[PDB]
Write an enzyme that holds these catalytic residues in place. Sequence first.
Site: not given
Ligand SMILES: CC(=O)N[C@@H]1[C@@H](O[C@@H]2OC(C(=O)O)=C[C@H](O)[C@H]2O)[C@@H](O)[C@@H](COS(=O)(=O)O)O[C@H]1O
Ligand SMILES: CC(=O)N[C@@H]1[C@@H](O[C@@H]2OC(C(=O)O)=C[C@H](O)[C@H]2O)[C@@H](O)[C@@H](COS(=O)(=O)O)O[C@H]1O
Length: 966
Positions: A450, A457
């Site tokens: 992002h 991340y």
């Molecule tokens: C910054 C962010 O939202 N990153 C995503 C994760 O969200 C964090 O970690 C968790 C969690 O329990 O893993 C919950 C909260 O949303 C936040 O602190 C999470 O959504 C993961 C999911 O990974 S995926 O299913 O394993 O591929 O994606 C994070 O990096």
């Molecule tokens: C849909 C939204 O609000 N925001 C976009 C990002 O999406 C979030 O982040 C991710 C993720 O894996 O990074 C997954 C979920 O859809 C949502 O939590 C994402 O699409 C970014 C683009 O990422 S970047 O190229 O690393 O900038 O754009 C956000 O606005």
Amino acid sequence: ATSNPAFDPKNLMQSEIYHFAQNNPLADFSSDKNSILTLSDKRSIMGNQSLLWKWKGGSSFTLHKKLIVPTDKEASKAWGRSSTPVFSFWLYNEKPIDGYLTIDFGEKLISTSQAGFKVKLDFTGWRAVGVSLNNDLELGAKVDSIRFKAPSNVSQGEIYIDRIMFSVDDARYQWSDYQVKTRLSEPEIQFHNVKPQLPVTPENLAAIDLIRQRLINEFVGKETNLALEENISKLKSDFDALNIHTLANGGTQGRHLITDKQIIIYQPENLNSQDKQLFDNYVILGNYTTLMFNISRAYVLEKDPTQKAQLKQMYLLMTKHLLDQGFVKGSALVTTHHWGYSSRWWYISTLLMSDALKEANLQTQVYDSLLWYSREFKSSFDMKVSADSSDLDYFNTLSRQHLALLLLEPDDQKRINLVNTFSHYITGALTQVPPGGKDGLRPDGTAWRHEGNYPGYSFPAFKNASQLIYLLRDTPFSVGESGWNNLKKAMVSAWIYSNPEVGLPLAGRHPFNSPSLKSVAQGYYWLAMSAKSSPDKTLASIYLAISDKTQNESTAIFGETITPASLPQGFYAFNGGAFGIHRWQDKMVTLKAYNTNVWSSEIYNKDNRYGRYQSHGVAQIVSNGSQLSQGYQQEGWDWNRMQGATTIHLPLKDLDSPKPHTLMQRGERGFSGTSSLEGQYGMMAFDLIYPANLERFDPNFTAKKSVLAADNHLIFIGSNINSSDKNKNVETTLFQHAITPTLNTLWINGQKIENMPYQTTLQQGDWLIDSNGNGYLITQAEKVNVSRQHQVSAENKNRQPTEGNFSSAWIDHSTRPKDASYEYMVFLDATPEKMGEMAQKFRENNGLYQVLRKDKDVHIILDKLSNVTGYAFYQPASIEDKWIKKVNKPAIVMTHRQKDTLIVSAVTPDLNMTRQKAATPVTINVTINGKWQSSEVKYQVSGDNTELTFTSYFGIPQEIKLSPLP
Ligand SMILES: CC(=O)N[C@@H]1[C@@H](O[C@@H]2OC(C(=O)O)=C[C@H](O)[C@H]2O)[C@@H](O)[C@@H](COS(=O)(=O)O)O[C@H]1O
Ligand SMILES: CC(=O)N[C@@H]1[C@@H](O[C@@H]2OC(C(=O)O)=C[C@H](O)[C@H]2O)[C@@H](O)[C@@H](COS(=O)(=O)O)O[C@H]1O
Ligand SMILES: [Mg+2]
């Protein structure tokens, strides 16, 4: 199916579905002479029967149904995203047909009569067909006929059809395949291949087989987002619920498999009650593939030969059902977007079951299938290194799945070529400095998604990238040392900026739910053990500390005695997030600013709504351990009063981001961040500048905020503080923490304060100690308010009310209507005795520090305890100073005169880039008084003075040790 027309304007979002589980199921259908229509319960998609259509070549049958086909604009207005009316059905072939089925739409059609489309019949098993009625036919309001015409050039044949559906669907997700051509196409993977090729040798094949075993070992001996089930009783019970049975001359019957995203085509929330009850019998692929994995893991571990055989039969039957349901090469199933969420543990299950698929003759079908659906990930799976290859989500969600797919390649030479190329791809992804804001590691050790440093991340990516390197270690496929080195930098950095959670300022859009290094612990062992000269003692010592393991335990883990890492000490600058970290004993202080290249905060529709001040020159103090246990409690937290920030105190309705969805507010200039000296001392320079015209942002809110950190202490100064309203409600927060039985005491001027509520006001020469042992000496302020109070707040996701009791103190800048200012000093090891000594030192002509300049151009702080001087040049300037004469760019300079030497550091926290451009180095000319000789810093004596030329790359400080010339 109801008596209503499809897309009934009155109830546009209600799908019409011919599933034949209702009365007079073929009422709406008629056939010509040369076609027969029966119901069959041999196989079905929705309910227990399907249409059996026997035909001679060229024969038609007609579905009689009025369609009020909406425009894409009408469909999109009814749903609220870009939409199209879709015609979809499922068909089954027991044998392939060399010809096309024609589906025609019109009014009062019969075999001898607008628009239509073709379905190629050369396949076996179930396929899905899905077309936009507006965009994909080769439709006037009066359509009431859908005519299915068997191929003209095939003399006889027979097809099973089920679940003929009229629905409103997402306009992105009708994909072309080997059966139907739509306006949309996800092109197949085209693997890159690196030269020279590794030969098939016994050594290279064994290394491949070892990599596969090492993956098995990781999945059978704890993954996030894997629903582990080790109880065989539970596994067989969930399996038996699938009601899968092998059929006579091939295929299966059992519950219908659908992905979490495929369900959209039904518009399930709008299904009529008859249809919903049938739809509720479907199985979600995520859960099914999780069951395949848990079974594959149970199989590998199972000691009883009979149970072990049963687990294998369950896995192969689930495989045969999955393939017969149309999850195969060339079958789009209309869409499989977000394929990884539904399939990630299928890929991993094939590693464990690789010999079982080989014996069953399913390896090639399963490989072809997984490769086809992976085409969604072609940007990464093609394995050509590009600016986007350092994707941190890929490392988390897909990297091990990618390796698994390659290992499932049936030819040996091709498998070795794919894994060699994969090793090259991962090396490049972990080595390259992506341009602009693109994902990946950075040269100061920050790690971006992002478009900024993002621990939420990076931490999961560190764990899996470390694991990948470890899986390939000590083979011809090992990741290059350049990628290992870069990842080491990022992971040692993470150890420095976490304690063991990252601070509130590094929490991204999840304040009060910081990622913890505890979740990354295993990555330190994996990276330590995959060093060229293993184990790496630094990464090994950090693994032991983060996992709470002793020196005694180390020999068995690493094969030699390693002392667990003590907490890092000194100062570390991370301008990738316009932050720095000061460490002393068990405390970390996160100093955080923001600028054009560093967003202040990520705020989403339901995340971090009150986060405006997350990076407002914050200085959050954290002792090793839980931040919640130190009183960083979300409930009742005053979002205005982030520790160290200068803010406008707003009602939450005005502090809330002005954008209903996303805002990542960047600053107004490149310069703001930190620098370091000798690895021990630091300075933050924060130019607080607001946008000219953003709703709820006071365009005239300003401040210059510097911090000098050394040893047990930090000196905080501010100047040039202003707002539109003579600094009304403008505040600098000394601290804020919850009151609990363990956090109940404040000290003010040697008196213990425990009452709640409590208010008082302090001035220059007063001091406090918060409940976490931080002392604050007020060295310049008119008005410091201290409060122990009940506070009402709102939680950052859904803005629901919260409450709690907090101790806090802040400077009230309203006493100085123009160019307000402050100074205060924090002691990280404060006791009432120590604060008494510091206050007396302050009263002795301030023996603690001296501000040598405090204006819009420069802030200069001499720390008399550490004998260090920090220079924040907000603008280039000539100055009067013992050491520094002139600096030609905005920069942070630091000096330390020790015995026979002067040590000078310099940097610009400005990364000197954009969201698109690569960072390039900034040349800074720092003129120092007097003649000096001596680091890549260049020096030249020039008259009575010395010109130093620093190169500031990605805000990475440089320093030089100088000694006087006679
Ligand atoms: C910054 C962010 O939202 N990153 C995503 C994760 O969200 C964090 O970690 C968790 C969690 O329990 O893993 C919950 C909260 O949303 C936040 O602190 C999470 O959504 C993961 C999911 O990974 S995926 O299913 O394993 O591929 O994606 C994070 O990096
Ligand atoms: C849909 C939204 O609000 N925001 C976009 C990002 O999406 C979030 O982040 C991710 C993720 O894996 O990074 C997954 C979920 O859809 C949502 O939590 C994402 O699409 C970014 C683009 O990422 S970047 O190229 O690393 O900038 O754009 C956000 O606005
Ligand atoms: Mg049916």
